[PDB]
Amino acid sequence: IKEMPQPKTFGELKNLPLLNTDKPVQALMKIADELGEIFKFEAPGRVTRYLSSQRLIKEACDESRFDKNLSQALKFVRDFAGDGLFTSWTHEKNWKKAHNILLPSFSQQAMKGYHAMMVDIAVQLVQKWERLNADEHIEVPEDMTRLTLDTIGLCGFNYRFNSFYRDQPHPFITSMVRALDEAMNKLQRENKRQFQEDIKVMNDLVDKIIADRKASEQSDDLLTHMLNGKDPETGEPLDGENIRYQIITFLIAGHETTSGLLSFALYFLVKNPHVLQKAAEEAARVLVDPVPSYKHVKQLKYVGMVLNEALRLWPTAPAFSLYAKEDTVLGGEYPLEKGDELMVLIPQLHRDKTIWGDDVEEFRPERFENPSAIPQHAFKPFGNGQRACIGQQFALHEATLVLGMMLKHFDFEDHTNYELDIKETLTLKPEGFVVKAKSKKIPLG
Amino acid sequence: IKEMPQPKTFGELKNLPLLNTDKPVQALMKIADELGEIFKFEAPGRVTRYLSSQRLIKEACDESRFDKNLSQALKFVRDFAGDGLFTSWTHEKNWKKAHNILLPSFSQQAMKGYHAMMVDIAVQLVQKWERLNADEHIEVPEDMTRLTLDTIGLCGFNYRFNSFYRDQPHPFITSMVRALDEAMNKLQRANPDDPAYDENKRQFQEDIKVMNDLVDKIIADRKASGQSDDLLTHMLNGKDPETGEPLDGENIRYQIITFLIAGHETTSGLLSFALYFLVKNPHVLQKAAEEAARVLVDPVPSYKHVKQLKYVGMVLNEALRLWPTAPAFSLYAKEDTVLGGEYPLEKGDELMVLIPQLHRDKTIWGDDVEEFRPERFENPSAIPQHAFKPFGNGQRACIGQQFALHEATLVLGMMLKHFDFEDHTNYELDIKETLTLKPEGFVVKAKSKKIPL
Ligand code: HEM
Ligand code: HEM
Ligand SMILES: CCCCCCCCCCCCCCCC(=O)NCC(=O)O
């Protein structure tokens, strides 16, 4: 049995003044660097324990002992995402209900169904970059957000945000980003009703999506299942309020982290030109049709390894929370009472040298040549167990398709020798990452 | 010999107070409705004579007697367009020089070469409209400007403005519109050096600077590349067969500005008006769409097929009849002479062809000149000479007329092939003037016919 580490507290404020940054996850990583595999963190009214080692997170991922918790961050996100799948408790009726109803929308059958629409948006990205003049450059996370938002809008809701027809972010994005940034800042605390205004912009958009569906054509997408699908357990469909919450939930969770992933993957590729070369070689060899087929995207194995290694270094959803189901001893050293909260600090987990070796900071896609020769619970960018990411296959198929087309159609240049600056909005993304792309002059479909 | 009519004068201000409007051409049309085929118009320091009848304009277009004049409007535009082709005198060395050097860019060879690029931009317009959601609409002159600006940028300079990637107007457009507007408004200032107005002129200089920054970008993108054969290639490399000389750098910059403006603004206006008249005349719309569907049989239009869109072309010509988007041009008298056997003119005297009013000459077109009927152009060689002048006259006529008409026929054809249109607001025609003419606030909804590209 051991006493759990905790950084300095300042009376009433507890550990809160130790963040005081626009980069709380990276700050918590520094704290983990100093204090080790586990430390307690208190804020006024709340307490949690940050885990950073595979040996402990392995235990935390045991669902007989720990269940998904709503961290304070997620409690703030619940103000607009409600009891949608991301921000609901496992024991809430609508969690299992919505999970059962929406899981078929992520069957491989459904993926094959989404592919043509993903290609629609991907082609828009490629054409945008084909049409740049020589003195121009690419704003990478901005365009990746254009792509991923449009993709979830079309595939999921037959709604076109038309982000590439705008040189500024879509209104939905501006409000979403401000709302997420506000939840994040609020963790460290007029902002108030600016928040309500951003929520209202997002909900107005949901209104537009529902109205566009009802005013139409036979459909079979995510929204079709939200509106009509029945839970096999209870026989019930989702009610209107939960449907609205699921739409918000999927529009946000369904694009933000994928944008981050494509941005980090391109970053690491232009910073490791031999790895870039291997990936481009694969894209050119596999993607032989004028636009990619589903079956060919499944063959992009090195590109998929590149994406996994980007997720290892900077998991764009960088933490998840658990609570203790019953009194127990964690790791045989740390006693926990029922209700006690844990935070998995994923980037730090992914730098556990006892698992990955001493060169954890290098970008080596080949770490994933044999993806489950990797020890249990060493790699958790998509969370855990029955509460793991429902959209993982969607995300990786989209990102593999898109990164594949990018590598097929252009040579990329890190023309500014960009210094990595990671912006935090609960999620992570490179900020200010820009490149130049030289077309290989290969025609589309 | 007859005394020439002139509307009311106001003490030193002369006829100026009869305008005082952001719609001066429409006002001159009302004045012409009152005074007839010709009237003198004086402002402080200047005088011109507005012509509205074919019988007089036929004489004005005789180049043995009259040559192109730089009107005050064009002298104001010359502040940023310099001695480019549009704003130079016929007998300026750089006019003939630039004419000889640049005319080859409008040969049929060259047009056939531009077709794929025009299709590139047209396809972008069609895709934008295909991708609108059910609750949305189209801002017509805005999207026509996106299309026409991009088309001259690409065909002329291998430069992509990427206007369809922006939800507001391109910066170049905002500055161009403000500069043209300033040129227009300045014509009606009694005392232009009044403090409120030189406070005003700062913006003019700023807008000229934006347009020139864009020129800098076009030149640098061309210089940074290693093979072309467009308008810019001829600007940079062509030599005048007469003098042996190339254009100098300064004149090249003026030409780039000139073609970026003249090469898109009036074509945007034309497509906008044409669509307006089509939705206001659904029978004509139906006929034109039938022609488009029958003719444009390939997944994207061929050069040869656009030429077969004869009714579409008639539609465009009738739009130009009712609202010629370059609505006037100016002439001077080469020597003392008599106009129409009634009106004496001295060397130097100016004439202005008031083109929309000419285009409403009932002795030429019949009594229903206000109605939209494309069939007016079925046999154009029965139309009297100089009855129809949307592209100016003689050796100073529009160098881009075929370019413009091919572009607009292609684009309007694809629009009619791919969508049914709805005048969902029952739009009330509002014509904005910036020297040139264009509908303002014109919006429609388009329902896709779901035909692939
Ligand atoms: C690279 C992209 C993505 C990453 C890194 C990611 C990460 C995660 C993580 C860590 C969780 C668990 C959160 C927790 O335990 O509190 C989660 C859950 C979830 N994600 Fe993803 N996600 C990604 C893409 C997507 C996409 C594209 C969608 C939708 C199409 C999506 C929808 C969801 C939903 C609905 C949940 C809640 C699942 C449930 O509890 O039933 N995600 N994601
Ligand atoms: C509907 C479209 C257009 C209309 C109605 C139009 C109208 C005119 C008119 C009326 C003139 C004579 C002006 C005067 O006498 O003062 C002119 C000249 C000119 N136009 Fe067009 N224009 C159009 C399209 C274009 C295009 C697409 C281009 C370039 C690609 C172009 C380039 C020019 C140039 C350079 C001149 C000056 C010619 C010279 O004097 O050498 N125009 N235009
Ligand atoms: C570089 C080309 C710029 C395009 C400008 C095209 C101008 C369109 C025709 C000019 C219209 C002039 C008529 C406006 C009112 C008027 O009274 N003008 C007389 C005058 O300015 O002297």
mmCIF file of C-alpha atoms and ligand atoms in Angstrom, chain A residues 68-69 74 85-86 95 99 106 152 222 249-250 253-255 257-258 261 311 315-317 319-321 380-384 386-392 394-395 398, ligand 1:
data_model
loop_
_atom_site.group_PDB
_atom_site.id
_atom_site.type_symbol
_atom_site.label_atom_id
_atom_site.label_comp_id
_atom_site.label_asym_id
_atom_site.label_seq_id
_atom_site.Cartn_x
_atom_site.Cartn_y
_atom_site.Cartn_z
ATOM 1 C CA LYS A 68 -17.225 5.332 -17.822
ATOM 2 C CA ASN A 69 -17.426 8.547 -15.806
ATOM 3 C CA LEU A 74 -17.987 16.174 -20.312
ATOM 4 C CA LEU A 85 -24.046 8.627 -26.683
ATOM 5 C CA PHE A 86 -20.846 10.550 -25.764
ATOM 6 C CA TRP A 95 -27.330 5.014 -23.635
ATOM 7 C CA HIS A 99 -26.189 2.298 -28.871
ATOM 8 C CA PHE A 106 -21.400 1.490 -38.387
ATOM 9 C CA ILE A 152 -20.158 13.568 -41.385
ATOM 10 C CA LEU A 222 -27.467 7.599 -39.600
ATOM 11 C CA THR A 249 -23.206 14.621 -30.659
ATOM 12 C CA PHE A 250 -22.361 13.022 -33.975
ATOM 13 C CA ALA A 253 -17.594 13.851 -32.172
ATOM 14 C CA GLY A 254 -17.982 12.825 -35.800
ATOM 15 C CA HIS A 255 -15.477 15.321 -37.206
ATOM 16 C CA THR A 257 -10.958 14.490 -33.707
ATOM 17 C CA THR A 258 -10.691 13.172 -37.253
ATOM 18 C CA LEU A 261 -5.791 13.127 -36.726
ATOM 19 C CA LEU A 311 -2.811 8.647 -32.748
ATOM 20 C CA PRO A 315 -4.417 11.147 -29.452
ATOM 21 C CA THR A 316 -6.787 13.888 -30.518
ATOM 22 C CA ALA A 317 -9.295 12.859 -27.864
ATOM 23 C CA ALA A 319 -8.254 11.593 -22.096
ATOM 24 C CA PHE A 320 -11.171 9.606 -20.791
ATOM 25 C CA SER A 321 -12.701 9.228 -17.332
ATOM 26 C CA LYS A 380 -6.239 3.692 -26.240
ATOM 27 C CA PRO A 381 -6.977 6.567 -28.617
ATOM 28 C CA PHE A 382 -10.608 5.315 -28.929
ATOM 29 C CA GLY A 383 -11.384 4.727 -25.257
ATOM 30 C CA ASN A 384 -12.382 1.416 -23.697
ATOM 31 C CA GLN A 386 -18.544 -1.075 -24.170
ATOM 32 C CA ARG A 387 -18.042 2.721 -24.066
ATOM 33 C CA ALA A 388 -15.331 2.736 -26.735
ATOM 34 C CA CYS A 389 -15.663 4.937 -29.829
ATOM 35 C CA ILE A 390 -18.656 3.818 -31.913
ATOM 36 C CA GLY A 391 -17.222 5.755 -34.891
ATOM 37 C CA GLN A 392 -13.680 4.318 -34.987
ATOM 38 C CA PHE A 394 -15.818 5.440 -39.822
ATOM 39 C CA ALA A 395 -12.971 7.729 -38.743
ATOM 40 C CA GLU A 398 -12.353 8.348 -43.928
HETATM 41 C C1 HEM C 1 -9.743 10.018 -34.866
HETATM 42 C C2 HEM C 1 -11.048 10.148 -34.625
HETATM 43 C C3 HEM C 1 -11.678 9.805 -33.252
HETATM 44 C C4 HEM C 1 -11.125 9.645 -32.031
HETATM 45 C C5 HEM C 1 -9.643 9.789 -31.601
HETATM 46 C C6 HEM C 1 -12.211 9.341 -31.108
HETATM 47 C C7 HEM C 1 -12.092 9.109 -29.762
HETATM 48 C C8 HEM C 1 -13.096 8.706 -28.910
HETATM 49 C C9 HEM C 1 -12.951 8.386 -27.494
HETATM 50 C C10 HEM C 1 -11.614 8.451 -26.696
HETATM 51 C C11 HEM C 1 -14.171 8.037 -27.024
HETATM 52 C C12 HEM C 1 -14.519 7.614 -25.567
HETATM 53 C C13 HEM C 1 -14.687 8.874 -24.713
HETATM 54 C C14 HEM C 1 -14.888 8.569 -23.242
HETATM 55 O O1 HEM C 1 -14.635 7.410 -22.803
HETATM 56 O O2 HEM C 1 -15.292 9.507 -22.495
HETATM 57 C C15 HEM C 1 -15.117 8.135 -28.130
HETATM 58 C C16 HEM C 1 -16.462 7.858 -28.063
HETATM 59 C C17 HEM C 1 -17.414 8.142 -29.008
HETATM 60 N N1 HEM C 1 -17.161 8.548 -30.307
HETATM 61 FE FE1 HEM C 1 -15.240 8.673 -31.115
HETATM 62 N N2 HEM C 1 -13.384 9.331 -31.822
HETATM 63 C C18 HEM C 1 -13.097 9.593 -33.137
HETATM 64 C C19 HEM C 1 -13.987 9.663 -34.202
HETATM 65 C C20 HEM C 1 -15.349 9.568 -34.119
HETATM 66 C C21 HEM C 1 -16.310 9.659 -35.203
HETATM 67 C C22 HEM C 1 -15.961 9.896 -36.697
HETATM 68 C C23 HEM C 1 -17.531 9.520 -34.656
HETATM 69 C C24 HEM C 1 -18.916 9.527 -35.335
HETATM 70 C C25 HEM C 1 -19.106 9.175 -36.614
HETATM 71 C C26 HEM C 1 -17.378 9.313 -33.237
HETATM 72 C C27 HEM C 1 -18.415 9.139 -32.339
HETATM 73 C C28 HEM C 1 -18.331 8.749 -31.020
HETATM 74 C C29 HEM C 1 -19.459 8.459 -30.148
HETATM 75 C C30 HEM C 1 -20.968 8.534 -30.472
HETATM 76 C C31 HEM C 1 -18.846 8.056 -28.814
HETATM 77 C C32 HEM C 1 -19.604 7.622 -27.542
HETATM 78 C C33 HEM C 1 -19.770 6.108 -27.733
HETATM 79 C C34 HEM C 1 -20.593 5.482 -26.629
HETATM 80 O O3 HEM C 1 -20.248 5.694 -25.441
HETATM 81 O O4 HEM C 1 -21.575 4.758 -26.956
HETATM 82 N N3 HEM C 1 -16.032 9.345 -32.945
HETATM 83 N N4 HEM C 1 -14.429 8.542 -29.270
#
